[PDB]
Design a protein around this nucleic acid. Structure first.
Ligand SMILES: NCCC[C@H](N)CC(=O)NCCC[C@H](N)CC(=O)NCCC[C@H](N)CC(=O)N[C@@H]1[C@H](O)[C@@H](OC(N)=O)[C@@H](CO)O[C@H]1NC1=N[C@@H]2C(=O)NC[C@@H](O)[C@H]2N1
Ligand SMILES: NCCC[C@H](N)CC(=O)NCCC[C@H](N)CC(=O)NCCC[C@H](N)CC(=O)N[C@@H]1[C@H](O)[C@@H](OC(N)=O)[C@@H](CO)O[C@H]1NC1=N[C@@H]2C(=O)NC[C@@H](O)[C@H]2N1
Lengths: 117, 63, 136
RNA sequence: AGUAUGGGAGAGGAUGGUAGAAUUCCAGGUGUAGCGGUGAAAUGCGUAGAGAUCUGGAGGAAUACCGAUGGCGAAGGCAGCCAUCUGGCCUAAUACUGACGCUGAGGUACGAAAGCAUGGGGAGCAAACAGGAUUAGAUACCCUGGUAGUCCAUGCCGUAAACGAUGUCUACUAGCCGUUGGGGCCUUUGAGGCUUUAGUGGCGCAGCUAACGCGAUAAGUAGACCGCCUGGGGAGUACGGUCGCAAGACUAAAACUCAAAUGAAUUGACGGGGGCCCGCACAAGCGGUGGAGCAUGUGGUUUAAUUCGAUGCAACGCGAAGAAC
RNA sequence: GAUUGGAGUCUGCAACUCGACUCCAUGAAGUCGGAAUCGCUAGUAAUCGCGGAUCAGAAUGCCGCGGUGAAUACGUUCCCG
RNA sequence: GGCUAUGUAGCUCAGUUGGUUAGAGCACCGCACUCAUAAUGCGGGGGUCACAAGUUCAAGUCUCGUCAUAGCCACCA
């Protein structure tokens, strides 16, 4: 119902899953899709293809809200960031900027123990 | 990063300028380092090995 | 072959039309060394299409094979020119068998005639291939 | 050996304040089916609305980049920034005292982490513990949680592969290349080049060593003083004693038993160590087997006997190129 | 073209257990085969027939012979040695 | 007595008001993978969907009754 022209794309990429959230500016969410939603259960969540599918779904859903140019922010390591941002452009959006915003501590809290596998 | 994109820049080329920006920044290296806690003994050993390797590289490139 | 690169085999043109495309199509049709039966089938099909429409068999066969020829295969990948002709002949062979004419030569002539105007089962197979291809 | 005066570098120590990033929790806005986790899963969280995203609060702990084979400290150790109190070191030239030195049994001070006592604090992490996995079993490694503890104040404990496995002090013995803090000299406008000194590194002549290796930061050549060793186990154990709230620490045997236990280096073998290449090994193709009926061999079962061998690849149309007698 | 009923030939002292072949009758499963797995780089694979050793008789096995006669190899990631 | 809710393989949960044209997970047995094993992958077997009738072109799936069970309530010969 509400019409916005400019938007923000948030990509939450990890070694386990990829979450794509489309917001307007000021951070109010409009649409979201994840690799878990489009099948790809379990270990299949982390492949770049699943991230691409989720990004395509989220972009198509946001197109109903009807915005044409968006700014993407990538937060996190792992596969699917590049595939997801490519899929957003391939849907027909104009990307205005692309930057990394993963949080980095200035030596804050202690991380968990190292895995002995 | 803040990779702003020109009128004639394609989407793929913009993303490519992006991974170069982020690879130059090296944030993913910090993310890799942060995920598990490393003991001070292991950190000291790693830095000692790095210093030895750097000096060997300097000697090799000088002669 | 790891190190060695092997040259592609060169086959002789067919004795009748001196066409390596016809020779290779005959080789695809032939089973267990019955080149005589393969020749009978292929030459009967060409004679049938020639009497149906007064057009040079070589030109008709090459035009139809170009029409059926795929630029991509089937999960999309890319193919080389040789694979294009190989897959075109491969798909053209089966539909004639599933047709219902009394002889294989008549069946294959009918299949070629139907694929030339686009209402062929091989054409449908190519359509499946490319409507699969746009998936990626 | 020490004192006065000028100058310099430093995560040296103690007290207080303060800044930014991030994690967790709380409230709210958008919004809707998943999130999280693994080799794969599951336990767990979520339609009384999670995860994601934005704004605002609470609290604790630690200080990204700089960062360095760098620096400081007797050792243990010390890293955001600012102020206060405070120790040592380096460097120049004069002046001053005139052997005032070195080492050090007993003694005494400090002394990582864990642990203990009293009172606080508690974000994250995490012994014990609970559950889910894996496994023949799993008490573990993996996963989801989680208490002591890790933090502060005041005390105790006195041990570490507390290591350079190398006690402190002094003098002498080729050279070459780095780096940190200073002094001097020379070019000539500003940045370079020579030296000298105190640290910190890489090679290396002589010498030394069983060898590996050390080699002006000696494991070389000599001197002063202290500590320690005398085959492997029993054993840093027992009894006695000192200290400690306790855990325990320190001092420290014998009976008995074996003919070895060790260090360095050499050849081979092995590795669920690495690198390199080839092969119808995989890819690309064509045709088969596993399904049916029958032939033949084997296992098993049965039998009076179903004669004996061959058993992963490398046994199974194999010895047998031919059992009605 | 399995199985079964009936009738025969030959080898052999002797075809019940337990031979091969011929004729009449009968006419089973089977309509292309799951997970998986095998061979083959050219006169090869595939397909068609012919011969021999053993041997009185008893090959779909073994060892040979010729006829017709293909498809595909971009490459070394992956699997095996 | 009144109101409700259930009864599906060797063991369990679906399938729930029409054309249900009963499946899913563990038990097995056989096969495959392995140097040997698992897990896993494949195949086969293992119920006849509480019973009895009614409508209907469609009934485990709906309507009537008869069982077994569970929950709450009511019972002054
Ligand atoms: N005046 C007061 C000054 C005080 C200050 N301390 C200065 C000083 O006095 N120094 C004296 C030098 C003695 C040195 N500590 C002995 C030594 O160096 N090795 C011990 C002898 C073992 C053996 N015979 C040789 C050996 O195995 N070597 C290895 C080897 O080359 C290489 O290992 C591998 N896998 O290839 C390398 C990479 O790690 O490690 C070396 N090993 C090590 N390198 C380290 C190092 O130098 N130190 C600390 C420790 O970590 C050392 N171990
Ligand atoms: C309070 N609720 C009970 C309490 O104080 N009890 C005793 C009591 O004061 C006294 O003993 C007697 N007199 O009975 C003392 C020694 O005499 O010891 C206390 N207890 C203790 N427990 C402690 C321990 O083990 N170490 C350290 C120190 O804290 C010890 N003192």
């Amino acid at each position: 119902t509400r019409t916005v022209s400019e938007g923000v794309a948030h990509i939450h990429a990890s070694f386990n899953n990829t979450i794509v959230t489309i917001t307007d500016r000021q951070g109010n969410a409009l649409a979201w899709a994840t690799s878990g939603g489009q099948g790809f259960r379990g270990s299949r969540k982390s492949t770049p293809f699943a991230a691409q599918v989720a990004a395509e779904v989220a972009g198509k859903a946001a197109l109903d809200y009807g915005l044409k140019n968006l700014d993407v922010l990538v937060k996190g390591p792992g596969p699917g960031r590049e595939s997801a941002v490519r899929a957003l452009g391939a849907v027909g959006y104009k990307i205005n900027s692309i930057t990394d915003v993963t949080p980095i501590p200035h030596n804050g809290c202690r991380p968990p123990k190292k895995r002995r596998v | 990063p803040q990779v702003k994109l020109k009128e004639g820049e394609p989407v793929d080329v913009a993303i490519r300028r992006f991974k170069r920006s982020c690879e130059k920044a090296g944030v993913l290296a910090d993310v890799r380092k942060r995920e598990f806690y490393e003991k001070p003994t292991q950190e000291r050993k790693r830095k000692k090995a790095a210093a030895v390797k750097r000096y060997q590289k300097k000697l090799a490139r000088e002669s | 072959p790891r190190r060695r690169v092997v040259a592609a085999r060169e086959i002789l043109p067919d004795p009748k039309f001196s066409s390596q495309t016809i020779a290779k199509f005959m080789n695809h049709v032939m089973q267990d060394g019955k080149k005589s039966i393969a020749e009978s089938i292929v030459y009967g099909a060409l004679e049938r299409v020639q009497e149906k429409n007064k057009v040079d068999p070589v030109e008709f066969f090459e035009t139809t094979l170009e029409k059926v020829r795929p630029m991509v295969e089937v999960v999309p990948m890319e193919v080389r020119p040789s694979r294009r002709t190989a897959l075109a002949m491969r798909w053209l062979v089966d539909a004639a068998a599933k047709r219902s004419e009394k002889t294989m030569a008549l069946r294959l002539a009918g299949e070629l005639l139907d694929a030339a105007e686009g209402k062929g089962a091989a054409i449908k197979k190519r359509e499946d291939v490319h409507r699969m291809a746009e998936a990626n």
